[PDB]
Enzyme design. Structure first.
Site, short mmCIF file in Angstrom:
data_model
loop_
_atom_site.label_atom_id
_atom_site.label_comp_id
_atom_site.label_asym_id
_atom_site.label_seq_id
_atom_site.Cartn_x
_atom_site.Cartn_y
_atom_site.Cartn_z
N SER A 46 -42.91 -6.28 -18.66
CA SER A 46 -42.10 -5.82 -17.94
C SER A 46 -41.29 -4.36 -18.81
O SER A 46 -40.59 -4.18 -18.79
CB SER A 46 -40.78 -6.57 -17.29
N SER A 107 -35.98 -5.83 -13.59
CA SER A 107 -37.54 -6.00 -13.68
C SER A 107 -38.71 -5.89 -12.10
O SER A 107 -38.97 -6.66 -11.73
CB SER A 107 -37.58 -7.75 -14.71
N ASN A 109 -40.60 -5.28 -9.32
CA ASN A 109 -42.07 -5.27 -9.15
C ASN A 109 -42.15 -4.31 -8.09
O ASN A 109 -42.92 -3.22 -8.32
CB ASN A 109 -42.65 -6.19 -9.28
N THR A 212 -36.19 -7.31 -20.54
CA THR A 212 -37.13 -7.86 -21.00
C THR A 212 -37.75 -8.09 -20.36
O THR A 212 -38.82 -7.51 -19.41
CB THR A 212 -36.46 -9.73 -20.33
N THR A 214 -42.16 -10.73 -19.64
CA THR A 214 -43.00 -12.72 -19.37
C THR A 214 -44.22 -12.22 -18.86
O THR A 214 -44.08 -11.50 -17.93
CB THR A 214 -42.10 -12.99 -18.36
N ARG A 220 -43.70 -13.45 -23.85
CA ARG A 220 -42.28 -13.00 -23.72
C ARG A 220 -41.73 -12.01 -24.47
O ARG A 220 -41.50 -12.38 -26.42
CB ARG A 220 -41.97 -14.28 -24.04
#
Length: 269
Positions: A46, A107, A109, A212, A214, A220
């Site tokens: 991301s 984040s 999608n 961030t 994942t 990470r």
């Protein structure tokens, strides 16, 4: 000596957590402050959503897009982890700006993929990395498959030094207008997903914003900026820790932030 301490601390985290940690810290011009595994490839996951928002702001800056333009969609745009996209579905659209903000701060999608649809897909993201002088970062796929992080796969990867310099380009290097630059900066600061990662390990008086990521297979990541001591920095952190728990991987990134803090506090101004 402080760069060796930095290396030593990170190696100890890698050994003890069975992890690989890639880091680059650069100044506003992209000059290296410190790094570790800086040229090793990692999955972006991301983290690329920050550059995608930049891409959109550049179109806005160039008069080829507007933030308020309505992007229509239906239920086929809903994919895993699309909190905003799902809320706006009945209304029938999200705007460019709404989508971009959701991408960066949540984040989201679906929001990400709605923007990719508009700009001509992953090739257009790669095109933009090239245009701002990043010869390394590549987007090959939409979400969530781009986050697969299959060992050895070169798709959807960057390096810490390439991404750190891309961050610096966007925030400090004149890639976007003053107004666009400030907007994206505040989005990074007000991110809703980063509270347990890098900014958990930085001093509470530092101004920090970040995006961030994942990945499957223990990825990470956290990329962004910080302002200490009057001094601005861009940072990119990518980690892979297949056997850690999700909470343990957040702790690992926060720890990296602690190690970064000690390095910066020991760097002469």
């Amino acid at each position: 000596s402080e760069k060796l301490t930095f290396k030593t601390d990170l190696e100890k985290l890698e050994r003890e957590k069975a992890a690989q940690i890639g880091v680059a810290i650069v100044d506003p011009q992209g000059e290296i402050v410190a790094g570790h595994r800086m040229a090793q490839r990692f999955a972006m996951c991301s983290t690329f959503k920050f550059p995608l928002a930049a891409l959109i702001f550049e179109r806005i800056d160039s008069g080829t897009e507007r933030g308020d333009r309505k992007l229509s969609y239906g239920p086929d745009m809903i994919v895993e982890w699309s909190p905003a996209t799902e809320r706006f579905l009945a209304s029938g659209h999200m705007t460019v700006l709404e989508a971009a903000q959701a991408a960066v701060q949540l984040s989201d999608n679906g929001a990400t993929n709605l923007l990719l649809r508009e700009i001509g897909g992953p090739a257009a993201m790669t095109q933009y990395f090239r245009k701002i002088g990043d010869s390394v970062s590549r987007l090959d796929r939409k979400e969530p498959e781009m986050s697969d992080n299959t060992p050895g796969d070169l798709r959807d990867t960057t390096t810490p030094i390439a991404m750190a310099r891309t961050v610096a380009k966007v925030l400090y290097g004149g890639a976007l207008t003053s107004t666009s630059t400030h907007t994206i900066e505040r989005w990074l600061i007000g991110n809703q997903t980063g509270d347990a990662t890098l900014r958990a390990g930085f001093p509470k008086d530092w101004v920090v914003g970040e995006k961030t990521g994942t990945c499957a297979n223990g990825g990470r990541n956290d990329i962004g900026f910080f302002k200490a001591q009057e001094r601005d920095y861009a940072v990119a952190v990518y980690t892979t820790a297949p056997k850690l728990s999700a909470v343990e991987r957040d702790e690992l990134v926060a720890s990296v932030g602690q190690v970064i803090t000690q390095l910066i506090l020991s760097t002469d101004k």
